[model samples]
Target: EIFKVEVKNMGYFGIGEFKKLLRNTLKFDVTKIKAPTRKEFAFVCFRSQEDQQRALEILNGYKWKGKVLKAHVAK
Candidate 1:
């Protein structure tokens, strides 16, 4: 199964912008990024569970656009 990361409390930015930043940072480790229409949170799917763990270690509680991002593995 792919590893999914749940990001909450994202600030006032479009999904494209957020995805760009995340993709740039995580590079090819992540396979895809998605968000619900008009939603504040996002779900990122990693190619492997190890990639998710690594990304989570770096991204969990990370701050962006004056907002602290919260990330966790989706159950």
Candidate 2:
């Protein structure tokens, strides 16, 4: 399964930094990342359902740059 994450008040993130945030901070192994041009949000595909579950558990209300992140299962 895939997950979608929405970050409010964030402008953009470099590809390297984005990957690092997922791998290091979230402890999630991402199979793919889809970043839009606006960069306020993104959808990520994880290698395992375990990773996706963990992400949803921990990242839903995590704060970054004073903005809370919103995460949920992708449709």
Candidate 3:
């Protein structure tokens, strides 16, 4: 399944958070493209664009692991 980085709320993020949210919310086996790089502030990958869209809706503006995480469907 192709995937991309899932960012959030216009903030900085990493792979740790990406995997956590994708699994927690979307319930998909979406993996990170790589360790989160300092590019575009956040990153994540999805199995499909449809999943990405659903995940974006579920994850967008969500608070997880204490910090207010931002869910983004990486391009």
* Best of the candidates, lDDT: 1
Global lDDT of each candidate: 0.76, 0.70, 0.59
* TM agreement with the true structure for every prediction: 0.79, 0.75, 0.56
In candidate 3 the C-alpha lDDT for residue 27 amounts to 84
lDDT of 3 by residue, 1-75 (tens): 565655545344555655665676558667555544633345556667777777667666667554565565455
CA shift of 54, model 1, Å:
1.6
The deviation in Å at residue 52 for candidate 3 is: 0.5
**Across residues 1-75, which tens digit of lDDT does each residue of candidate 1 receive?**
878888877867787777766777666366777786636688888888888887788777778777877788886
Per-residue lDDT for 43 in model 3? 56
lDDT of each residue in 1-75, candidate 2, tens digit only: 445444344456566776778888777888888776636677787888788788777777877645677776776
